[PDB]
C-alpha cells in the first residue's frame, strides 16, 4: 500500500464515478445505481456491507479518505487470460477448441453490445491466425494477452 501522487490524483476522478451527486460521500443508494449500471444486482444488505467495510468512522457513507485508504490495499492485479478463454468457450458449440469465422461473426453481430460487420472483419483477420476460417480461441486469447 503506497499510492503514488499520480494514482492519488486519478483516484479522485475515480471517486466521481461513485459519488453520483458530488456531495463528497458515497451512499448505499449511489452504489446500487453504479452496481446496476455495471449489470449487477446487489441486495440492500450487500450494499450496506460494501459501505460498512470501508466506512472508517461509522457515519454510514464513504468519503474520499476512506475510499482511497481501501484502494491502497487492493492495487494488485492479475492476468485474465483464462477467464477470457472461458468466455470464448461459451460459443464453442462442439467443444473442440474452435469457433468458425462465420459463427464468430454471427455471435459478434447479434449478441451483447455487438460489433459492426467492418469491426468483425478486423477481429477475424487477427483471430484466424492460420487463415483456415477457424479461430483457435486459446491461441487468439494468448496473443491478445501476451
Amino acid at each position: 500500500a503506497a499510492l503514488t501522487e499520480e494514482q492519488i490524483a486519478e483516484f479522485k476522478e475515480a471517486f466521481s464515478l461513485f459519488d453520483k451527486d458530488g456531495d463528497g460521500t458515497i451512499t448505499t443508494k449511489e452504489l446500487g445505481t453504479v452496481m446496476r449500471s455495471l449489470g449487477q444486482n446487489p441486495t440492500e444488505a450487500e450494499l450496506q456491507d460494501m459501505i460498512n467495510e470501508v466506512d472508517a468512522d461509522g457515519n454510514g457513507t464513504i468519503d474520499f479518505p476512506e475510499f482511497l485508504t481501501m484502494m491502497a490495499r487492493k492495487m494488485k492485479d492479475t492476468d485474465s487470460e483464462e477467464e477470457i478463454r472461458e468466455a470464448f468457450r461459451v460459443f464453442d458449440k462442439d467443444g473442440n477448441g474452435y469457433i468458425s469465422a462465420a459463427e464468430l461473426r454471427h455471435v459478434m453481430t447479434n449478441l451483447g453490445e455487438k460489433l459492426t460487420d467492418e469491426e468483425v472483419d478486423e477481429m477475424i483477420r487477427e483471430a484466424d491466425i492460420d487463415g483456415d476460417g477457424q479461430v483457435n480461441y486459446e491461441e487468439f486469447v494468448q496473443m491478445m494477452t501476451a
Binding site: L17, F18, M35, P42, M75, I84
Partner: protein
C-alpha cells in the same frame, strides 16, 4: 497500462465478517456442525445399540449446518467480487 488485467482476488475467503449477521450465522452453524458431528459419531460408534432414528435426526441437523456454512462462504465470495468490481471500475482512471 493494465490492458486486460483485473484486481486479484484475495488468497482465501477471509472477509466481511464485520457484517455481524454473517458472523452470527457462522458461529451458530459452525457450533451446530460440531454438535451434530459429535452426536452422529456417538450414536454410530460409541453406542452398543445404533438407534437409526436418532441417527437420521442428527444427519438432518448435520447437513443443515454444513450447508449453512457453505451458504455463508458463497455469500462472502459474492461480496468479495462485488467489491473487486468497484475496485476495477476505479482502476480504469489509472489509464
Amino acid at each position: 497500462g493494465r490492458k486486460l488485467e483485473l484486481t486479484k482476488a484475495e488468497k482465501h475467503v477471509h472477509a466481511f465478517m464485520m457484517d455481524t449477521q454473517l458472523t452470527k450465522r457462522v458461529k451458530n452453524a459452525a457450533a451446530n456442525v460440531l454438535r451434530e458431528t459429535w452426536l452422529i459419531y456417538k450414536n454410530t460408534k460409541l453406542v452398543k445399540k445404533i438407534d437409526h432414528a436418532k441417527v437420521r435426526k442428527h444427519q438432518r441437523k448435520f447437513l443443515q449446518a454444513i450447508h449453512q456454512l457453505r451458504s455463508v462462504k458463497m455469500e462472502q465470495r459474492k461480496l468479495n467480487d462485488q467489491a473487486n468490481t468497484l475496485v476495477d471500475l476505479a482502476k480504469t482512471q489509472l489509464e
